[PDB]
Amino acid sequence: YSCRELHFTRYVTDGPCRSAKPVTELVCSGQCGPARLLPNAIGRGPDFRCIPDRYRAQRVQLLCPGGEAPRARKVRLVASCKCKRLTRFHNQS
Amino acid sequence: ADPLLLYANRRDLRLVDATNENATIVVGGLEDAAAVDFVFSHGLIYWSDVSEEAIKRTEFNKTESVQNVVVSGLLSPDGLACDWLGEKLYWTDSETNRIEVSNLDGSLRKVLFWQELDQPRAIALDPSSGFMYWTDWGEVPKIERAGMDGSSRFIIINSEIYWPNGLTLDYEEQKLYWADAKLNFIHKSNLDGTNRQAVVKGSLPHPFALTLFEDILYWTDWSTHSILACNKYTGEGLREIHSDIFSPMDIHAFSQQRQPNATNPCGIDNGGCSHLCLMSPVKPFYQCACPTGVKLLENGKTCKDGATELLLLARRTDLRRISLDTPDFTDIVLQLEDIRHAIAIDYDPVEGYIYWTDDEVRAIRRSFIDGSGSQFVVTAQIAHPDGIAVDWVARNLYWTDTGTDRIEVTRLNGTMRKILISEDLEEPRAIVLDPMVGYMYWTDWGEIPKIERAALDGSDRVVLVNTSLGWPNGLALDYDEGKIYWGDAKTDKIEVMNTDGTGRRVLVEDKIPHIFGFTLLGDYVYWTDWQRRSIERVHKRSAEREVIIDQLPDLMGLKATNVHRVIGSNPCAEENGGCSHLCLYRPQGLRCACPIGFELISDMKTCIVP
Ligand SMILES: *[C@@H]1O[C@H](CO[C@@H]2O[C@@H](C)[C@@H](O)[C@@H](O)[C@@H]2O)[C@@H](O[C@@H]2O[C@@H](C)[C@@H](O)[C@@H](O)[C@@H]2O)[C@H](O)[C@H]1NC(C)=O
Ligand SMILES: *[C@@H]1O[C@H](CO)[C@@H](O[C@@H]2O[C@H](CO)[C@@H](O)[C@H](O)[C@H]2NC(C)=O)[C@H](O)[C@H]1NC(C)=O
Ligand SMILES: *[C@@H]1O[C@H](CO)[C@@H](O)[C@H](O)[C@H]1NC(C)=O
Ligand SMILES: [Mg+2]
Ligand SMILES: [Mg+2]
């Protein structure tokens, strides 16, 4: 595989509440493998795993059991998949 | 009975006869035998190994000829050539982009070139003139020539060239033969590039290494797994001489008649040079040279006692030093053993010891700049040493361990452990010292971020900074200007302050995403950026910046310092200030201290058990 964008529909939840219509989330799967040898290179480091590139954000109205009006909420999801690095949390091990 | 062809087969070094086809193996058991040359007079065969990442030698006259490890710390040594006159050894590296040189015993590594080298490949020598020749097939394919001393480097081919894989000389006719693997030909030229005339025009699948003998050419080809051979002058007689090869690489004609005897300008006295007597084209045809990072004195012959200003670095799996006396900024891989996760580091100009920590070995360790004398200082009761500091005056060692959230102190050789700062501390790391004034400085993390200060005994702990603090990972002091410098990774910013708490201005704000390593030395401040895997410097008074090495993974922490020059004194130096164990200086005067299990006596100097 080569780091494609797989899709599947899901509902969004706040526990007892549930969104009216669903939402197609995307999941970065695939195998962003290491680049092969340069054509005139001698044969025989980095880690470029398939990671969410850009994110999207949609508004979905939330619905809760009888007695309450349809609350509204905004949720952000995955849009594109690329192969980048990872540098955020700062610790030792 | 005629030219024996020595070639590297990725797994062993073989030797064919040009007349007939029984190939005798020279050295087997190799993993990726790439380039090879020889020193017939000394009877040695050198070769490279891109998988073991090293260059080895063996005496072919001696039976059961055990190998001799010559180099280690290379990335992709694609080319190699021996200097059978000045007893020197030149090689290239297509990844680190440099061309080094050393003696035969692997000693005295000097980087001769690091500029404008994309993917250098093959290299050839002519020591009787003092000219080295090499090729490059990367961004701008070219064939360069230069003095074997590292001078008069001139690009001699740049037109109609793409994959100049192989290269050799015709000493009898003073010409230059190279082969292009994509442009599919072999051309000759005079030793400067003039009268480039064609030899073999077609019929070359993918050659890699070319060699010459008498009026006959010999080269390896990759797509055919064989050794072709043609006439040196005419393109006629395209032949197969040795076919069905595993994976042929570099080939030379193996005979003394390819390394002609000539007179050495270095003579018996090594040309008077202290270290390296390299060949040169300019009179007197040699030039004295110093190893990487060490500058040459006014003699033009006598090297300096090591490199003066020096920048020691800690990565995760290795330790590396970078000399500051030369613009090459070559990071010498400090030859050490069992370094799983090196964190903090410091130096001691008095003894020449490098004190570094490790959170998976759980030990504070100590070594020379060379890498000899690797010894464990503190072995047990150690969790996460994110910061270490050397009191070069009182001969004591300080460190911070956030696993136990405490700061302790011993003498430089591990003895006399005493817990100084135990309480009111949240993930502390960096630590610098000022023994002349008698204050210690340190930082902790973002929950209650601060840069606290106390004496060397754990007294009068006064919190220095409390505002606009995020991830203060580094700390450094400029003693001559009474100001301390720190650096933050959460605020993505680095600022300065005076010890009086007077000025507090931001130095650089633009592109400092995440600094962990941090040090200061004489109007320059060096830092180690995570997320960019780079190291730069900043001018103190100015704000200029200079990338010294970019793209280096697993970067941690560094401290810059001088070698064999130290400053500062206080009462603790004189016979340990009369203390039996610990001499902890502070403005009130020194204070003798005992470890655990011992107590302080009436004289407030000695220590015995109860
Ligand atoms: C040291 O070795 C050289 C060259 O030997 C060659 O390489 C080794 C690995 C063996 O495979 C040998 O069979 C090869 O020839 C010897 O030089 C030879 O000298 C004479 C006998 C002649 O055949 C000449 O063409 C060769 O170059 C050399 O004699 C040897 N040293 C000693 C003391 O024997
Ligand atoms: C270094 O270790 C050595 C022994 O391994 C020690 O040096 C001497 O140790 C004895 C025994 O405690 C003391 O009485 C001496 O005073 C020490 N010598 C000096 C010059 O102080 C010591 O534990 C460590 N430190 C030093 C400085 O030697
Ligand atoms: C740290 O914060 C406390 C209260 O937030 C404040 O009183 C104190 O002055 C701060 N530290 C310094 C050095 O001012
Ligand atoms: Mg060569
Ligand atoms: Mg390169």
Numbering used by the authors:
A (entry chain C): 78 to 121, 129 to 177
B (entry chain A): 19 to 38, 41 to 630
Source paper text:
The crystal structure of a complex between LRP6 E1E2 and SOSTtr177 (a C-terminal 37-amino acid truncation mutant of SOST) suggested that the C-terminal region of SOST might contribute to LRP6 binding. The mFo-DFc difference electron density map calculated after rigid body fitting of the MR solution revealed clear density for SOST NXI motif at the top surface of LRP6 E1. In our structure, R121 made close contacts with the E73 side chain and the backbone carbonyls of V70 and L95 in LRP6 E1. The shortened C-tail of our SOSTtr177 construct (169-RLTRFHNQS-177) facilitated model building, as we observed a clear side-chain density for H174 at the center of LRP6 E2, where H174 stably interacts with polar residues of LRP6 E2. H174 of SOST made close contacts with R449, W465, W491, N493, and H534 of LRP6. Unexpectedly, in contrast to LRP6 E1, LRP6 E2 showed conformational changes upon SOST binding in that residues at the center of the LRP6 E2 propeller were rearranged to accommodate the insertion of SOST H174. The ligand-binding pocket of the SOST C-tail-bound LRP6 E2 (consisting of W491, N493, R449, and H534) appears remarkably similar to that of the SOST loop 2-bound LRP6 E1. A possibility that a second SOST molecule bound LRP6 E2 was excluded by the fact that 1:1 heterodimer formation was observed for the LRP6 E1E2–SOSTtr177 complex using multi-angle light scattering (MALS) analysis. However, the current structure clearly indicates that SOST interacts with both LRP6 E1 and E2 through loop 2 and C-tail, respectively. First, the SOST loop 2–LRP6 E1 interaction is more extensive than the SOST C-terminal tail–LRP6 E2 interaction (~540 Å2 versus ~400 Å2, respectively).
Low-density lipoprotein receptor-related protein 6 (LRP6) is a coreceptor of the β-catenin-dependent Wnt signaling pathway. As a member of the LDL receptor family, LRP6 is a single-pass transmembrane protein with a large extracellular domain (ECD) consisting of four repeating units (E1, E2, E3, and E4), each of which has a YWTD β-propeller domain flanked by an epidermal growth factor-like domain. The LRP6 ectodomain binds Wnt proteins, as well as Wnt inhibitors such as sclerostin (SOST), which negatively regulates Wnt signaling in osteocytes. SOST inhibits new bone formation and growth by binding to LRP5/6, thereby inhibiting canonical Wnt signaling in osteoblasts.
